[PDB]
Write a protein that binds this ligand. Structure first.
Ligand SMILES: Nc1ncnc2c1ncn2[C@@H]1O[C@H](COP(=O)(O)OP(=O)(O)OP(=O)(O)OP(=O)(O)OP(=O)(O)OC[C@H]2O[C@@H](n3cnc4c(N)ncnc43)[C@H](O)[C@@H]2O)[C@@H](O)[C@H]1O
Length: 185
């Protein structure tokens, strides 16, 4: 079972995914976490990825998809399903995933307003300092989300597997909608 979780920067994808892990026991893989682990290793690749992420741009498909596949294989013997958080972010990412790994059975669209996202991320940046959570980068991330990631939602509407959750609600209320969608599989 492969669930794609897609939504804008600060929409709440990670938060929902962690609640899914606690209740359903799925494996949460986050493209952003995997990339940041590479940056942390101090590799030369990590330095290149750090520069791209600091600017709010997309890392190349080849690198991100390798790391997702790497992480899925590492968990394959224990997982009863996967939550793929933050991948895909463009239609070609979904297609290559389906070529190289498998088809998703559900896409959870974590839908938040643009203003709400800016506020959440500005607050998180003030708190925890994540280097891409500054105002300029937030704006680029959000603009790129509108442009590149929204057509992913359409693709999977065509496929018939998108379920939208209202991420303007409180966290637990969103999670009731998430749980409905997952229970109905
Ligand atoms: N597939 C890909 N291809 C190419 N490049 C890629 C890639 N994936 C990653 N990258 C690169 O890596 C970078 C980082 O990607 P990534 O780490 O994916 O960051 P992102 O998508 O910008 O999303 P965040 O994780 O910032 O937000 P989130 O939606 O999970 O929200 P959270 O739950 O944390 O919550 C946000 C805040 O709001 C709070 N909150 C959450 N829900 C609610 C709620 N309902 N009410 C109130 N507060 C809430 C949370 O507590 C938190 O403080 C990308 O910009 C790109 O450069």
């Amino acid at each position: 079972k492969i669930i794609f979780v897609v939504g804008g920067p600060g929409s709440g994808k990670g938060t929902q995914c962690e609640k899914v892990v606690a209740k359903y026991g799925y494996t949460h893989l986050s493209s952003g976490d995997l990339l940041r682990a590479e940056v942390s290793s101090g590799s030369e690749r990590g330095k290149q990825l750090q520069a791209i992420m600091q600017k709010g741009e997309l890392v190349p498909l080849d690198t991100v998809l390798d790391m997702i596949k790497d992480a899925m294989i590492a968990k394959a013997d224990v997982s009863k399903g996967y939550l793929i958080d933050g991948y895909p972010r463009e239609v070609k990412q979904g297609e290559e995933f389906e070529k190289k790994i498998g088809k998703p059975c559900l896409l959870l669209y974590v839908d938040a307003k643009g203003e709400t996202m800016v506020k959440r991320l500005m607050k998180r940046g003030e708190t925890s300092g994540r280097a891409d959570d500054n105002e300029e980068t937030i704006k680029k991330r959000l603009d790129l989300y509108y442009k590149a990631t929204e057509p992913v939602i359409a693709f999977y509407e065509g496929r018939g597997i998108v379920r939208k959750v209202d991420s303007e609600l409180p966290v637990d209320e969103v999670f009731k909608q998430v749980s409905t969608a997952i229970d109905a599989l």
